[PDB]
Amino acid sequence: RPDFCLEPPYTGPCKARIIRYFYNAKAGLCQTFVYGGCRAKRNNFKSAEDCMRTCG
Amino acid sequence: RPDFCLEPPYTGPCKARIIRYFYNAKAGLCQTFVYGGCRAKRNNFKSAEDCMRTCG
Amino acid sequence: RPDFCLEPPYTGPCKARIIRYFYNAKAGLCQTFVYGGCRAKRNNFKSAEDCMRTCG
Amino acid sequence: RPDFCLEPPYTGPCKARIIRYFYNAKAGLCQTFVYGGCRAKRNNFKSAEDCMRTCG
Amino acid sequence: RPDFCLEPPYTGPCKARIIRYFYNAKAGLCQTFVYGGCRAKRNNFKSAEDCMRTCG
Amino acid sequence: RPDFCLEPPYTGPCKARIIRYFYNAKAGLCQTFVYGGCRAKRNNFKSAEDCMRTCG
Amino acid sequence: RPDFCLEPPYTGPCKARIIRYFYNAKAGLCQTFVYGGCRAKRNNFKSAEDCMRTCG
Amino acid sequence: RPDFCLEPPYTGPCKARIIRYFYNAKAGLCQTFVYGGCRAKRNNFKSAEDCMRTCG
Amino acid sequence: RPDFCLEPPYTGPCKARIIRYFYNAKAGLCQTFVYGGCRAKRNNFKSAEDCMRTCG
Amino acid sequence: RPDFCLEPPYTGPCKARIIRYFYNAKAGLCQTFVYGGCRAKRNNFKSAEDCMRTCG
């Protein structure tokens, strides 16, 4: 799996409360987190399917 | 049905106001609740279809 | 995890070509499969989020 | 619950393969079926949430 | 039409601002209202299609 | 209501099987029909909400 | 085109921040506006496709 | 408006029947067409909102 | 690519927190930003697919 | 970018006609392709946003 899959979720400086998925390396699966709407990091997926396939 | 279907809905510490479904064992059906966006428990479904099938 | 998470994906007798998710116990993650539209088994999720949480 | 909730699912004369929900009075929950796209009966829901609330 | 179709829309105690549909018996059609996310009444539909068919 | 609301649903020459809504003047409400994907007439709505408001 | 297509967008008294489309007669096209969630006027479309066809 | 807004809709060699929008320069608005799923040209929009804004 | 693809993202005067995509000419790809809900500029896409094709 | 981003799109053995995105290394952007519904490879994204961020 890609190295960015090991990064902690990043909400960012923006004010939106949008649900995104990130890979939790410790748990071994993708979980939800609140994304601000801008300046996203690579461990940020709009689709859980994409999260599992890319990082799983 | 799985034991987690008996736990009460858990909103969590996050600030989002997202609608999710949980199985209400008493009522015998799935109902809506507000999910915060993180630290979800197992009785939390994005799709009502999934909620009925998994817990119904 | 629930025992139904161990059953193979079931397309069913119906003629629709709808994408659903099922838990692949060997792979340790949820994958896609084509659902016919009726007579679904429990290892059938409309949302990948629901699949990981329920069976992961 | 409304009397139409006791009707069997009706696919109709049209050629589409769309997933809809109907209340299965015997099973006591909503299930999926393939809707043709036209001439729908009342026990036909686009949302599973609506199906459980209206007929549950 | 079902008796619950005659009830006024109920937002509920929760804080979400989700759009739902309710049947306006006076107007003879379904209209939008803001649902809080929990403790929904029967005259609350996620889909306008479901609202017209159930109450129309 | 607009005059186009009185027109019969028009599927068109294209091959797609997409669900759309049209106003049924006789029934006094919007119903579903299968749209081919091209050369749409005015009594064709992607949203049932839009159909009721425009033609209801 | 219908006369309601000439009305200015109406947000309404409700507290939601939902994106809707309205026909801008001067610009000759549909644009976005923030709908409150209730008491909608006719120049309010959930789908841009519906807006262009109904008012264009 | 961009020059690609003047090109005719292109379905492509693929077998899917997906609805997309294209700008009809003559009609002065965006209309639907069936996209095959691959080798898309620039006058192909997933969202009608994007089509009006980009080409309108 | 169109000249509007070079303009910075514009949130606008409205109060909604909606995610949209804009083309980042320097980065050479589309990124997310928070749109207010009204008075949109041309470098604002509802679909990321549309953003890459139009500006990429 | 990950090595799987260099792989050609893979439709698979299944019979569904679902649109997915894949990274076209030569073009330097994500494009659409038809996915069969099963046995997906890593260069397969449900969201174009995810495709650009993961492979861009």
Side-chain angles (χ1 to χ4, degrees), chain A residues 1-25 27-38 40-56, chain B residues 1-38 40-56, chain C residues 1-38 40-56, chain D residues 1-38 40-56, chain E residues 1-25 27-56, chain F residues 1-25 27-56, chain G residues 1-38 40-56, chain H residues 1-38 40-56, chain I residues 1-38 40-56, chain J residues 1-25 27-38 40-56:
Chain A
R1 70 180 109 273
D3 276 27
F4 67 76
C5 296
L6 307 176
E7 291 304 309
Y10 180 73
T11 293
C14 286
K15 303 278 95 172
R17 281 95 167 251
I18 306 303
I19 287 193
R20 286 291 137 111
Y21 305 92
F22 74 98
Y23 183 72
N24 188 143
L29 46 68
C30 295
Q31 300 175 331
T32 62
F33 83 95
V34 180
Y35 178 48
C38 71
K41 287 278 217 300
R42 289 213 247 37
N43 195 10
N44 179 326
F45 300 88
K46 178 166 178 174
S47 163
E49 185 193 319
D50 293 350
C51 184
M52 299 185 293
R53 183 181 297 128
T54 298
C55 296
Chain B
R1 70 180 109 272
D3 276 26
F4 68 77
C5 296
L6 307 175
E7 69 195 6
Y10 180 72
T11 294
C14 285
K15 303 292 185 177
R17 281 95 167 251
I18 307 303
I19 287 194
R20 285 291 136 111
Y21 305 91
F22 74 97
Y23 183 71
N24 187 145
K26 197 284 187 196
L29 46 69
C30 294
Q31 299 176 331
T32 61
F33 82 96
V34 180
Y35 177 48
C38 71
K41 287 278 218 300
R42 289 213 247 36
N43 196 10
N44 178 327
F45 300 87
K46 179 166 178 174
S47 162
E49 184 193 320
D50 294 350
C51 185
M52 312 177 296
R53 184 181 297 128
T54 298
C55 296
Chain C
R1 70 180 108 272
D3 276 26
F4 68 76
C5 295
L6 307 176
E7 64 193 9
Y10 180 73
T11 294
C14 286
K15 304 294 185 176
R17 282 95 167 251
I18 307 303
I19 287 193
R20 285 292 136 110
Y21 304 91
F22 74 97
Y23 182 72
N24 188 143
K26 183 192 178 181
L29 45 69
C30 295
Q31 299 175 333
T32 62
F33 82 96
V34 179
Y35 178 47
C38 72
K41 286 278 217 300
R42 289 212 247 36
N43 195 8
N44 179 326
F45 300 89
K46 178 166 177 173
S47 163
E49 184 192 320
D50 293 351
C51 185
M52 305 180 292
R53 183 180 297 128
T54 298
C55 295
Chain D
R1 69 180 109 273
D3 276 26
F4 68 76
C5 295
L6 307 175
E7 307 168 9
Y10 180 73
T11 294
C14 287
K15 307 290 183 175
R17 281 96 167 250
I18 306 302
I19 287 193
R20 286 291 137 112
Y21 304 92
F22 74 97
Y23 183 72
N24 187 144
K26 231 235 177 175
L29 45 69
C30 295
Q31 299 175 333
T32 63
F33 83 97
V34 180
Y35 178 47
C38 72
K41 288 278 218 299
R42 289 213 247 36
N43 196 9
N44 179 325
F45 300 88
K46 178 167 178 174
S47 164
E49 184 192 321
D50 294 351
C51 185
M52 301 180 294
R53 182 180 298 128
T54 298
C55 295
Chain E
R1 70 180 109 273
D3 276 26
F4 67 77
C5 296
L6 307 176
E7 298 300 335
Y10 180 73
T11 293
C14 286
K15 310 282 188 171
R17 282 95 167 251
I18 306 303
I19 287 193
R20 286 291 137 112
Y21 304 91
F22 75 98
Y23 183 72
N24 188 143
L29 45 69
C30 296
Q31 300 176 330
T32 62
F33 82 95
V34 181
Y35 178 47
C38 71
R39 307 236 89 248
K41 287 278 218 300
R42 289 213 248 35
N43 195 9
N44 178 327
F45 301 87
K46 178 166 178 173
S47 162
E49 185 193 320
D50 294 350
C51 184
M52 305 180 296
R53 183 181 297 128
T54 297
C55 295
Chain F
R1 70 180 109 273
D3 276 26
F4 67 77
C5 296
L6 307 176
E7 298 300 335
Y10 180 73
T11 293
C14 286
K15 310 282 188 171
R17 282 95 167 251
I18 306 303
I19 287 193
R20 286 291 137 112
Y21 304 91
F22 75 98
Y23 183 72
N24 188 143
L29 45 69
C30 296
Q31 300 176 330
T32 62
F33 82 95
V34 181
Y35 178 47
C38 71
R39 307 236 89 248
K41 287 278 218 300
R42 289 213 248 35
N43 195 9
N44 178 327
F45 301 87
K46 178 166 178 173
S47 162
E49 185 193 320
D50 294 350
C51 184
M52 305 180 296
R53 183 181 297 128
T54 297
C55 295
Chain G
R1 69 180 109 273
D3 276 26
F4 68 76
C5 295
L6 307 175
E7 307 168 9
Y10 180 73
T11 294
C14 287
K15 307 290 183 175
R17 281 96 167 250
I18 306 302
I19 287 193
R20 286 291 137 112
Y21 304 92
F22 74 97
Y23 183 72
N24 187 144
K26 231 235 177 175
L29 45 69
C30 295
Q31 299 175 333
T32 63
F33 83 97
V34 180
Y35 178 47
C38 72
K41 288 278 218 299
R42 289 213 247 36
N43 196 9
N44 179 325
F45 300 88
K46 178 167 178 174
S47 164
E49 184 192 321
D50 294 351
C51 185
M52 301 180 294
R53 182 180 298 128
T54 298
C55 295
Chain H
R1 70 180 109 272
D3 276 26
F4 68 77
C5 296
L6 307 175
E7 69 195 6
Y10 180 72
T11 294
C14 285
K15 303 292 185 177
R17 281 95 167 251
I18 307 303
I19 287 194
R20 285 291 136 111
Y21 305 91
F22 74 97
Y23 183 71
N24 187 145
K26 197 284 187 196
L29 46 69
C30 294
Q31 299 176 331
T32 61
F33 82 96
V34 180
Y35 177 47
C38 71
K41 287 278 218 300
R42 289 213 247 36
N43 196 10
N44 178 327
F45 300 87
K46 179 166 178 174
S47 162
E49 184 193 320
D50 294 350
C51 185
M52 312 177 296
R53 184 181 297 128
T54 298
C55 296
Chain I
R1 70 180 108 272
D3 276 26
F4 68 76
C5 295
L6 307 176
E7 64 193 9
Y10 180 73
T11 294
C14 286
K15 304 294 185 176
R17 282 95 167 251
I18 307 303
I19 287 193
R20 285 292 136 110
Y21 304 91
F22 74 97
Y23 182 72
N24 188 143
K26 183 192 178 181
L29 45 69
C30 295
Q31 299 175 333
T32 62
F33 82 96
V34 179
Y35 178 47
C38 72
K41 286 278 217 300
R42 289 212 247 36
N43 195 8
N44 179 326
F45 300 89
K46 178 166 177 173
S47 163
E49 184 192 320
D50 293 351
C51 185
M52 305 180 292
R53 183 180 297 128
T54 298
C55 295
Chain J
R1 70 180 109 273
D3 276 27
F4 67 76
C5 296
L6 307 176
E7 291 304 309
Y10 180 73
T11 293
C14 286
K15 303 278 95 172
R17 281 95 167 251
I18 306 303
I19 287 193
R20 286 291 137 111
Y21 305 92
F22 74 98
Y23 183 72
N24 188 143
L29 46 68
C30 295
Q31 300 175 331
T32 62
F33 83 95
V34 180
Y35 178 48
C38 71
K41 287 278 217 300
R42 289 213 247 37
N43 195 10
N44 179 326
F45 300 88
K46 178 166 178 174
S47 163
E49 185 193 319
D50 293 350
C51 184
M52 299 185 293
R53 183 181 297 128
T54 298
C55 296

